[PDB]
Structure formats: structure tokens, C-alpha cells
Antibody
Framework: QVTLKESGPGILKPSQTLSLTCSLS??????????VGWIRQPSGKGLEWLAH???????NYNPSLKSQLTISKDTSRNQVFLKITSVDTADTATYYC???????????????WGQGTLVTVSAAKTTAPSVYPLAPVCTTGSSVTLGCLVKGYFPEPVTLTWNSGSLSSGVHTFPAVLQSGLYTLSSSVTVTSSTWPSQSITCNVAHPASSTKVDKKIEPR | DVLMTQTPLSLPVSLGDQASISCRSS???????????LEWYLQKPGQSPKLLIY???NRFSGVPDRFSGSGSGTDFTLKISRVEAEDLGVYYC?????????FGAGTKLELKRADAAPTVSIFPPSSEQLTSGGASVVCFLNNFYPKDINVKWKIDGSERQNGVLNSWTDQDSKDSTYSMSSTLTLTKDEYERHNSYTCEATHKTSTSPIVKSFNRNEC
């Protein structure tokens, strides 16, 4: 089989120099008409082409970022590299190593994509979240919605459950967003109005990287 | 740059229907060597994109014949004869002719369902957050369809546009609705200075907005 495998640092700070590696197997950087490129994707955003390199050391670059971009290869190890200098939060993305050949026979098309390596550019230190309960406002209806707010954490992820996971339906846990610097996430749980405040409810928020585990009981006002 | 405009950016289908996706380029994507390097990619959630079609209409090995690509010059179309459940995801067109190589923004192949109005819930700052010196007001807008929604925050009857963070869920796989969280984050000082807090949502399912409010002082 032909496999491409991307390795990166996971996390670097702005201004720093990103170094990606693509380790190739099941074909060589050595045939005439052979190439490997880099395409990237921020989360919930599109694909951007970055650079491409050929068997004959010819290189193509995205003009937007030519001053920050250097692409190279090592035909012996079958590897290709990408270096991106003076990175910033905008360069937060998944980076894919893709194969593309100049010739029809070998592959004039991105047929083979690796799984991608996530690269997070952040100045942030490890930071524990604050876990706020969200009680309904001061009734008269069938459903009541409770919420939980997890604010100011780094890195990802937090996990969130309601009553240790024992309450699993009517839940909505939203993707993390950036404020700073730092992540915020929120979750809502909708239960039948007879349930709460009679039967208690608690969001259970873990943030592994700070060793944080917070159980926050939704108290009625 | 060659701009790659996909139409639509959201394609609601029912399984079994015919789906067509338009890609139009701002320049001819014919290379000097005679070939038109127009490609189509499908990205399923949490996977890497896959090649479906190369040079306008060539299906890549193992892509089934329900997919076809057509067109010429600047105007291109991907067509799905009968849409399967496995075909949902984001479809990109791509021109490999001119530097920089460019993708379209992507077209999300999503499920049709009946319209569903949002359940709006608004939540004041916790005491816990306030003892810290910040103040976040939260609005959940859950289980609505279609995805198009306009949410504004109002403080004492007037619109607020700075400090608002938004997060959307993908289409639910069990009921096909969408959901959204909106957080107005203020300083506690600011929160104690104002009284009336409103989150309002205008959704096609009603002529008038869904309004959810609270007054700080009554909490």
C-alpha cells in the first residue's frame, strides 16, 4: 500500500517556526513525474494549498505566504518537509501531506491524502477552566433547560457530562470557541419540568491538562 | 488567484434524490498543455478529503458511477444520480491549473427535514463568575431547521455587537435539526450598570422574533 504519514509539534507559540514532516511509503520521491504537497484546513474552514515539490526539486508556493514558506525533501528516507516561520493563531489548522504527480500515469490529482496532523498556534499557558452553572431565569411549561458554561481553558480538550453521564439525552454540547488566547465551551440539558429541581442535576467538567475535575450542581434561583 | 465559486454552499437533499453542485471559476482552468485540471473532493466529518473526480469528468478508482462531473471552461457541475447516506459531507471543487492552486469554499450536502423553530433559553451570569469580575449572558437556541438564523443581543433595548461568541452544532444525525449557543461576555461592572438583557432570534419559522429576556435586578 501507498501511505503518507504527517508528523508535527502539536503546539507552538506565535512567532515560532513550524516544522512538518511527511514520511512516505509504497512509492518513491524518485520517479520522473512525482510530487508531494501540503494542504491545510482550519477547523470549520476550507482547504488551502500551501506548497508543492517535485522529483526534480522544482517547488511551487502559495504567493500569500511565500516569505514564510519553505518546502524540501529527502528522497532516501522518502520524506518531505514543510517549514513555516513567524506563525500565528491564523495558522492553527490540520496539515495534510498529499501526493500529486506532474504526469498522467503516476497521478495528476490528489489521490493519496494522509490523516493530517493538528497544529495549534497559541501563546497560552496551561490554564484550568472556570465551570459556571446556568440556572433558568425566575413557570409554566413542559420542558426546562439547564446550562453549563466552561470558560477560559487551555489546551483542549474538556469533557462534559450531566450527572456523570447518567443523563445523556436532551443534551447539547457545543464546539469550543476562542476568547483570548483561551477556549470556552457550553452545554445545555433539557428535561421534563417535573424532574428538576426535585431530582438534582450537575454538570461534570474535566480538563485533563490542568488535572481539573469540577462537579457543579445547578441550583434553582 | 482563480476564484472557485460553488453553488449552493448548502444543499438540502432527501436520501435517494438527485443532487447537482455548481463550480464556476474566475478564469479558464485550461492548462497550456491542453488539460483542464478541475477536481472534486468529498470530505466526510472527521476524515481527510477524498478524490472523486479528476480532469472534469474522470472518476477515480473505486468511486461509484452515481457520481458524475461535467462542464467546460469556467463552468463545472458535480452530479449525484441518487444520493446515499454515505455521500453526505462537504464537497470541494479544485483547480490544479494555475498557481496558487485553489479550492472552492465547499458545499455541504445536508438532509432535508420539516421546518423546526428554535427553543430559546437565556441565562444570566452565575454568582461564581461574578465573584471573579466577569459577566457572561448565555442564550441557547436549540433544535431548529433550516440552519439560517439571526441572533442579536440587546442591553436596555439597544443592540450589542462587541463581545459576542457563537458556536453551532452540526446537523443532528437522529432528528436533522441544528442548535446554537451565543454568549455575551461583559465586565461585571458593565453588567451591574445595565438591567434589561435580551437575546432575540429571527428564524424563517416566524414573522416576528423569538424574544427571551431577563432583568438583572429581579434575579
Amino acid at each position: 500500500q501507498v501511505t503518507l504519514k504527517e508528523s508535527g509539534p502539536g503546539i507552538l507559540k506565535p512567532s515560532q517556526t513550524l516544522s512538518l514532516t511527511c514520511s512516505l511509503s509504497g512509492f518513491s520521491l524518485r520517479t520522473s513525474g512525482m510530487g508531494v504537497g501540503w494542504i491545510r484546513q482550519p477547523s470549520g474552514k476550507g482547504l488551502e494549498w500551501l506548497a508543492h515539490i517535485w522529483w526534480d526539486d522544482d517547488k511551487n508556493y502559495n504567493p500569500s505566504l511565500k516569505s514564510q514558506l519553505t518546502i524540501s525533501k529527502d528522497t532516501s528516507r522518502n520524506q518531505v518537509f514543510l517549514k513555516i516561520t513567524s506563525v500565528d493563531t491564523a495558522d492553527t489548522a490540520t496539515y495534510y501531506c498529499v501526493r500529486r504527480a506532474h504526469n498522467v500515469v503516476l497521478g495528476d490529482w490528489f489521490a493519496y491524502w494522509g490523516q493530517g496532523t493538528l497544529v495549534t498556534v497559541s501563546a497560552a499557558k496551561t490554564t484550568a477552566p472556570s465551570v459556571y452553572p446556568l440556572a433558568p431565569v425566575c413557570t409554566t411549561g413542559s420542558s426546562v433547560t439547564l446550562g453549563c458554561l466552561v470558560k477560559g481553558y487551555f489546551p483542549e480538550p474538556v469533557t462534559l457530562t450531566w450527572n456523570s453521564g447518567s443523563l445523556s439525552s436532551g443534551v447539547h454540547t457545543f464546539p469550543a470557541v476562542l476568547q483570548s488566547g483561551l477556549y470556552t465551551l457550553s452545554s445545555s440539558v433539557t428535561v421534563t419540568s417535573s424532574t428538576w429541581p426535585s431530582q438534582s442535576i450537575t454538570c461534570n467538567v474535566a480538563h485533563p491538562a490542568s488535572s481539573t475535575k469540577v462537579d457543579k450542581k445547578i441550583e434553582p434561583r | 488567484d482563480v476564484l472557485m465559486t460553488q453553488t449552493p454552499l448548502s444543499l438540502p437533499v432527501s436520501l435517494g434524490d438527485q443532487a447537482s453542485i455548481s463550480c464556476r471559476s474566475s478564469q479558464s482552468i485550461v492548462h497550456s498543455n491542453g488539460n483542464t485540471y478541475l477536481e472534486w473532493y468529498l470530505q466526510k466529518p472527521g476524515q481527510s478529503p477524498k478524490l472523486l473526480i479528476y480532469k472534469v469528468s474522470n472518476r477515480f478508482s473505486g468511486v461509484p458511477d452515481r457520481f458524475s462531473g461535467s462542464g467546460s471552461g469556467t463552468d463545472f457541475t458535480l452530479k449525484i444520480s441518487r444520493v446515499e447516506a454515505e455521500d453526505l459531507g462537504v464537497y470541494y471543487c479544485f483547480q490544479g491549473s494555475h498557481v496558487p492552486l485553489t479550492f472552492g469554499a465547499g458545499t455541504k450536502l445536508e438532509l432535508k427535514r420539516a421546518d423546526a423553530a428554535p427553543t430559546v433559553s437565556i441565562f444570566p451570569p452565575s454568582s461564581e463568575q461574578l465573584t471573579s469580575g466577569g459577566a457572561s449572558v448565555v442564550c441557547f437556541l436549540n433544535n431548529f431547521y433550516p440552519k439560517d438564523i439571526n441572533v442579536k443581543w440587546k442591553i436596555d433595548g439597544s443592540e450589542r455587537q462587541n463581545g459576542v461568541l457563537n458556536s453551532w452544532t452540526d446537523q443532528d444525525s437522529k432528528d436533522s435539526t441544528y442548535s446554537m449557543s451565543s454568549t455575551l461576555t461583559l465586565t461585571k461592572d458593565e453588567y451591574e450598570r445595565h438591567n434589561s438583557y435580551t437575546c432575540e432570534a429571527t428564524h424563517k419559522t416566524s414573522t416576528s422574533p423569538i424574544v427571551k429576556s431577563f432583568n438583572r435586578n429581579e434575579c
